[PDB]
Each structure stands twice: as C-alpha cells, then as structure tokens.
Amino acid sequence: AAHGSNPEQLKHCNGILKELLSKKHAAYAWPFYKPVDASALGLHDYHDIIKHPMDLSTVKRKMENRDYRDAQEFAADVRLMFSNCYKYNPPDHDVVAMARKLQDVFEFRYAKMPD
Ligand SMILES: O=c1[nH]c2ccccc2c2ccccc12
Incomplete structure (x- = not known):
C-alpha cells in the first residue's frame, strides 16, 4: 500500500544505513559490512x-535498487541480520556484543522516524 510518506521514511532509513556504515561505529559495525564468508571462517554449519x-x-x-517499498521492509532486514548473529553464536561471544551495540544505534534512530 504505497503511502505518500513512504519516500520520506525511506530517506530516513537510508540515513540510518549510512550512519551504520560510518567511521563513528566502525569499531563494532565491521563484522556486518559484508556477507558472512562461512567457509573462510571455518563455520561449516552456518548455512x-x-x-x-x-x-x-x-x-x-x-x-x-529501490527494492524496499517501505520502512518496515528495511527494518525487517536490519533486524534479521542481528537475529542471525544471536541465533548462531553463544551469547557471550564478542561478535554478539558488537551486534547488540550496533542494534542499539539502529533501534534508537529508527524510533525517531518522521511520521
Ligand atoms: O555471526 C557471526 N559469527 C562468527 C563467529 C566466528 C567468527 C566470525 C563470525 C562472524 C563474522 C561476521 C559476521 C557475523 C559472524
């Protein structure tokens, strides 16, 4: 259901995405920059x-590619990425600590959605 506010909310989503990729958060965002190379990391059960x-x-x-039709679709993908980390790893793994920190950045700015 294309709403008049979808482009504006998508711009906010794109701003969040840019921030997640920025040097400000690189110390804990870097594991999430690219697809997990499970074979390279020896994680032969990952997939x-x-x-x-x-x-x-x-x-x-x-x-x-304008694949996301609305903010909700974008948010579901960012959260899927984090949930994958919480599903695969023991909860005390360093990478989970980084995911929690990056997700805090995501959730608090996603909540400032103009609407
Ligand atoms: O969920 C992950 N588990 C891992 C476990 C061991 C080494 C690396 C990773 C990893 C790397 C990048 C993104 C996610 C993950």
Missing part, C-alpha cells in the same frame, strides 16, 4: 543454521 543470511552491503544494494 544449516542460518537459512536467510543478511548484511549491511546487501541492505545497501537493496536500498540502491
């Missing part, structure tokens, strides 16, 4: 456990 991989470069391509 048996994670059926729907997601990462910030894929979100960016989807935004650039």
Whole structure:
C-alpha cells in the first residue's frame, strides 16, 4: 500500500544505513559490512543454521535498487541480520556484543522516524 510518506521514511532509513556504515561505529559495525564468508571462517554449519543470511552491503544494494517499498521492509532486514548473529553464536561471544551495540544505534534512530 504505497503511502505518500513512504519516500520520506525511506530517506530516513537510508540515513540510518549510512550512519551504520560510518567511521563513528566502525569499531563494532565491521563484522556486518559484508556477507558472512562461512567457509573462510571455518563455520561449516552456518548455512544449516542460518537459512536467510543478511548484511549491511546487501541492505545497501537493496536500498540502491529501490527494492524496499517501505520502512518496515528495511527494518525487517536490519533486524534479521542481528537475529542471525544471536541465533548462531553463544551469547557471550564478542561478535554478539558488537551486534547488540550496533542494534542499539539502529533501534534508537529508527524510533525517531518522521511520521
Ligand atoms: O555471526 C557471526 N559469527 C562468527 C563467529 C566466528 C567468527 C566470525 C563470525 C562472524 C563474522 C561476521 C559476521 C557475523 C559472524
């Protein structure tokens, strides 16, 4: 249901995406920049456990390709990326700590959505 505010909300989404990729958050965002290379990392069970991989470069391509029709669709992909991390790893793994920090950035700015 294309709403008049969808373009404006999508711009806010794109701003969040840019911030997540910025040097400000690089110390904890970097694992999420590119698709997990499970074979390279020796995680030979990754794709048996994670059926729907997601990462910030894929979100960016989807935004650039106008794949996301609304803010909700974008938000579901960013949250899928984090949930994949919380599903695969023990909760005390360093990468989970980084995911929680990056998700806090995401959620608090996503909540400042103009509407
Ligand atoms: O969920 C992840 N688990 C891992 C476990 C061990 C090494 C690396 C990663 C990793 C790297 C980049 C993004 C996500 C992950």
